[PDB]
Each structure stands twice: as structure tokens, then as C-alpha cells.
From a paper:
We next investigated how the in vitro reconstituted csg sheets were related to the native S-layer on membranes. To this end, we purified vesicles from H. volcanii cultures that have been previously observed (Shalev et al., 2017) and visualized them with cryo-ET. STA of the S-layer lattice from these vesicles resulted in a sub-nanometer-resolution (8.0 Å) structure, where all six domains of csg, detected in our single-particle cryo-EM structure, could be unambiguously resolved. The relative arrangements of the domains in our STA map were nearly identical to those seen in the in vitro sheets. A notable difference in the S-layer structure on membranes to the in vitro specimen was opposite lattice curvature, suggesting that the membrane might play an important role in affecting lattice curvature.
Numbering used by the authors:
A (entry chain E): 353 to 510
B (entry chain F): 35 to 352
C (entry chain A): 35 to 193
The structure:
């Protein structure tokens, strides 16, 4: 719950710390939702797929992949982020997850069942420069607003 | 001073000297100048002769009770002595232009690119008062201080087409604001804000719709021309619509492939291009039909959309 | 120059000299000429006497706030010095004629014979600006560059 306090006319800023508020108003603030839709269920190794999902309260989002350890960052490319429209939806063009350069993509190259999740810009290099450049652990990834879904990679076909 | 208003960093001045100009809605200052040395003025000729002009009081408007013209101290006579001519306040043209030109007023623009916009206008009253700019959200609240970037809210006369903050015009960074339709309000500094002296320029902010293309028909036969429209593009920039030569008929010639796209609409140049050179419709100097690999037609955009056309004749039935 | 516009292959010119004519919707150029040497002008006689004409700004229209007439530098007086008369822009007559005469405007014509058509007009503003021609399809698109054959889209006065 968040409150707003007003003060009588003519009061100074410094002198208003102790005096009681003439009136007040309160509002509630909750955390939004950030989920992925398309990178779910199945994935052919080496194939290209789009990034589909929604983000109610987000500006920059990053995609991470985890398998028995750290969440290795996936280098999507330009600025490692996706903007969100007014409809609380973010999208990306067709991207080959394994094709792209980075150690994050290397986990998905081998056949198996893994996990992929998205996270808002609340990380911001877990404190520092305004860029998503880390490999957030389980505690760091879960602490912020995020969501993950199970994914498994299937070998190629013809 | 008066007539050179920005020379003293003043937004206005009401110290009228002899022979200067005065506008309809002014409020003359009775301090030193031609407001205490000569407060009573009378008309000279035309519809204004005989009519008096009281400088100690605000001047009326809409060309009633104060006809436009030169005013004497003696009236219609043989004296040419402390002097006032009465004009009308006017805003003639005003536009919103991007950092590299291109009017974007009354048209939706991408939030990403709406970060270096400019506001320019031409107004008649430059000797008297500058013109203010006030950005208003669709909810109707003054957000000017949030979006202001420079020039101190004052835009000079002329300076239409000024893409830099060095010239007259104010820059607004509307990138941070959400999607919606916004209104920019221009009006005089103090008094000249009534009709014909103020103008509201609208502006739409929305999510960047990627380039959209539509056809008036999808199922057509050969020979039937089809008009294609490009939608949601930045004004003043040149798109390229490409045509894969594999869809072309095999028995086509070099001159037969350069006429797939017509000069209809906003199309600028037509021809066939390759990774190294291009063969336009002007001459058959570049790649030939077998040498080239793409057919193109560079097209600009005026407003929110541009329209072109194609010749489905000599196209493979697929 | 001004008054002989096609003599310099120009579609327009806004360098007004003393004694020339000016039309309602013009936008005078403040460069060399009677736009920086004398930017303030006042009326002479009739309904235009006393009224001022600001050359540094676009000129209003519909005969309001700018009465038609000769304008002095001094106003109604004993001076006949840098000078402007204000007329109105006008197109009087215009027709579409076949290669051997015969008006075909507003009338259906055969596609076979519609291959050597001409467009002609008479306009008042010949000293200031030429008049453009723009062919529009029923769908409402500029097809001028496809159908143009010559004369460079500019049609002269008379003719």
C-alpha cells in the first residue's frame, strides 16, 4: 500500500517532515507478469523460431537457458533486449537459438530436455552498467520478475 | 528593444516608439515611451480616419471599433508626427519535422523515432511578442517541462525547415511518453493568443507498425495491373520494393523486365539491379536480364502511405 | 526574371521589383529585390489606403485584410516610389482538344483516339508562377509521369 500526504499552504519542504498531513490517499502496487509462448514444448536443433510472449511491466527483457547449473545468457543480438508495445506484448523475428553465437546457445546444441526463461530489465547487470551482461544464478533469476517453461530439443529431420 | 526582441533576452516589450507597429490585442505600457508622451492618437486615412486610438487602454480586436491603418497625432492633416500603424496578428505556417526533415504533423510516428522532433512556425508578430509552445497530453495536462529539450520554449520567426537547435524552433523528446494523440499549442507570449494568432498542431504516438503492404486484389490474371500500397513508414525516406527474377517469364528480355513496376504513384526510379550494379529504365547500360537478379522500384512516401503499381503481364502463372 | 518566367527555364520567381504585380497567395522572398530593400508597404487609394502590406510574410487571401490596389511606400501621398499592385489569381478558360481540334472535355472518348490529347488553359498569374497539370485515375492516384508526352507539365498563358 502506497500513500500520498498533502500539507497546508505556505509550509516549507524541510519543515513539513514532522507536521501531520491535512489529507491522504492510498493506492496498491503489484508485480506484473512476464511469460514466453512460442519457445515451448519442442525444438528442432539448428532450426529458427520467433520469440513470442507478453510483459505487463517491462522495458527490456532477456532470455536465459539453464541446465543443471547457472542460467547462461543467450546472446540474441542487438542490445540483448526486446521492447514492449502498449498492448503489454513483445515479439522478435525468427531466431536460430543454437545458430547464434554465445555460450548460452551451446547448451541447447546437444539433445535433451532443458529450461528457458525470460526476465525483465530489473537485473541491469545485477547492479552496474545499463546492460544485461551476466549469468544470473537461481536466486538472482528468481528474485526479479521472470517466468520459465520446460523445453526439449529434438534432432534434425528430412 | 522593440523590433529586435531576442536581442535583450526578453519574451516581449511594450515600449512603443514613434513610427512602429502595433497589433490588435496589445496592452500598451504607459511608462516612458509613446504611452505617456502621447497617449491620445487619431486615425489618418481610409476607414481609420477620425477614429481615435486610446493607448492607455487595451486595444480592441476583430477589426471593429479600431480600423487598421496609420494613425496621426493630428488626424487626417498636414502633420507626420508621433505615429502608430495597426496590423493584425497572424500565424501563417507551422510544421513538426524530424531531425533530418520530413513533416510529421497530423500523422502517427514511432515512439522510438519520436525523440528528436522539432516545432517551427511563422508568425506576423515578431517585433512585439514571441510565441509559446505548450505540449498537451490526450488527458489534457501540460507536459511541456518533461519533453522540452532546448531553445527555451520560444520559437523565432521564419526558421521553417530548421532541423537543428541552432536555428529557431523548439525540440521535444516525445519518446518517453506512452502511445496516444497529442496536441501542440502555439500562442503569443502575453496578449496575442486569440483567433488567427494561435494554432493547435496535433501529433499521434503509437507502437511502430512494421512496413505494411496491401493489394487491391489477390487473384488476378495476366495483363491486369495491380496497385500496391506501402503503409506505416517514416515520411521523406525511400523504400525499395523488390521483384525476384525467378517469377519472371523465361522468354523475357532486358527491356521487358524493366517495365514490371510502373512510374504510377510515388515511385521514383524503376529498373533491375544486381549485387554490383543496377540497370535503370533510363538506359540499358547495367546488367542484362540474364545478368541481373532483382527487379526493383525505389519509392518514397508522402504522409502515412504511398501507392505504386505492377504489371502482372509477362509473369509466371504461380 | 519576373514577368518573363520561361525565359530562364524557371517555374516561378519571387524577386519582385518596383512597379510589378503581386497576387493574393504569394510568399515574397526576403532576398535581394523589393523584399529587403523595402519590406513595409502601405496602401494608396480606394479601400486599400492606410492598410499595410507586409512583404516579409505570406499575403492573405479572399480580399480580406489586404484590399486590392496600388501600394505606396508613403501611403496616400505625393510620392510614387517603390511600388506594388495587388491583383487576384484566376483561371479563365481551359479545354482538352484532340490533335486536330475539337473539345473533348467532360465527354467520353474512344481509347484508340485518346492518344494525342492536349490540355490548354488561360490563367491570370503568368508573371509569377506557371500552372501544373496532374492527371488522376478514378482510383485517385497520380499517373502524370505515365501519360506525359511533352512540354514538361507546364502550360503557357494563352495558347
Amino acid at each position: 500500500e502506497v500513500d500520498l500526504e498533502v500539507y497546508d499552504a505556505g509550509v516549507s519542504a524541510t519543515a513539513a517532515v514532522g507536521q501531520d498531513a491535512t489529507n491522504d490517499i492510498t493506492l496498491t502496487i503489484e508485480e506484473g507478469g512476464t511469460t514466453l509462448s512460442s519457445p515451448t514444448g519442442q525444438y528442432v536443433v539448428g532450426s529458427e523460431v520467433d520469440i513470442n510472449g507478453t510483459a505487463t511491466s517491462s522495458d527490456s527483457v532477456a532470455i536465459y537457458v539453464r541446465d543443471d547449473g547457472d542460467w547462461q545468457l543467450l546472446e540474441i543480438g542487438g542490445d540483448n533486449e526486446i521492447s514492449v508495445d502498449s498492448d503489454d506484448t513483445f515479439e522478435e523475428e525468427d531466431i536460430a537459438l543454437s545458430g547464434l553465437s554465445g555460450d548460452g546457445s551451446s547448451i541447447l546444441s546437444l539433445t535433451g530436455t532443458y529450461r528457458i526463461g525470460v526476465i525483465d530489465a530489473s537485473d541491469a547487470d545485477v547492479g552496474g552498467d545499463g546492460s544485461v551482461d551476466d549469468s544470473l544464478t537461481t536466486s538472482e533469476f528468481t528474485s526479479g520478475v521472470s517466468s520459465s517453461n520446460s523445453i526439449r530439443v529434438t534432432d534434425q529431420a528430412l | 528593444e522593440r523590433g529586435n526582441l531576442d536581442a535583450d533576452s526578453e519574451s516581449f516589450n511594450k515600449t512603443i516608439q514613434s513610427g512602429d507597429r502595433v497589433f490588435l490585442g496589445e496592452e500598451i505600457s504607459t511608462d516612458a515611451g509613446l504611452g505617456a508622451s502621447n497617449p491620445l492618437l487619431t486615425g489618418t486615412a481610409g476607414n481609420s480616419e477620425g477614429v481615435s486610438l486610446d493607448l492607455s487602454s487595451p486595444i480592441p480586436q476583430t477589426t471593429e471599433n479600431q480600423p487598421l491603418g496609420t494613425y496621426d497625432v493630428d488626424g487626417s492633416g498636414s502633420a507626420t508626427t508621433p505615429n502608430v500603424t495597426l496590423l493584425a496578428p497572424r500565424i501563417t505556417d507551422s510544421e513538426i519535422l524530424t531531425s533530418s526533415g520530413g513533416d510529421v504533423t497530423g500523422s502517427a510516428i514511432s515512439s522510438s523515432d519520436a525523440g528528436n522532433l522539432y516545432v517551427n512556425a511563422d508568425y506576423n508578430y515578431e517585433s512585439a511578442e514571441k510565441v509559446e509552445v505548450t505540449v498537451e497530453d490526450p488527458s489534457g495536462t501540460d507536459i511541456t517541462n518533461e519533453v522540452l529539450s532546448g531553445t527555451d520554449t520560444f520559437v523565432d520567426d521564419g526558421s521553417i525547415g530548421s532541423t537543428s537547435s541552432t536555428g529557431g524552433g523548439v525540440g521535444i523528446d516525445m519518446s518517453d511518453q506512452d502511445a496516444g494523440e497529442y496536441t501542440i499549442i502555439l500562442e503569443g507570449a502575453e496578449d496575442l493568443d486569440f483567433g488567427d494568432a494561435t494554432e493547435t498542431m496535433t501529433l499521434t504516438i503509437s507502437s511502430q507498425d512494421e512496413i505494411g503492404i496491401e493489394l487491391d486484389s489477390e487473384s488476378v490474371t495476366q495483363g491486369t495491373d495491380v496497385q500496391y500500397t506501402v503503409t506505416n513508414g517514416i515520411d521523406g525516406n525511400e523504400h525499395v520494393v523488390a521483384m525476384d527474377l525467378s517469377d519472371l517469364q523465361n522468354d523475357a528480355t532486358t527491356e521487358q523486365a524493366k517495365e514490371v513496376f510502373r512510374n504510377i504513384g510515388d515511385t521514383s526510379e524503376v529498373g533491375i539491379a544486381n549485387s554490383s550494379a543496377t540497370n535503370t529504365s533510363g538506359s540499358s547500360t547495367g546488367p542484362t536480364v540474364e545478368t541481373a537478379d532483382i527487379a526493383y522500384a525505389v519509392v518514397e512516401i508522402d504522409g502515412a502511405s504511398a501507392v505504386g503499381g505492377i504489371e502482372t503481364q509477362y509473369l509466371d502463372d504461380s
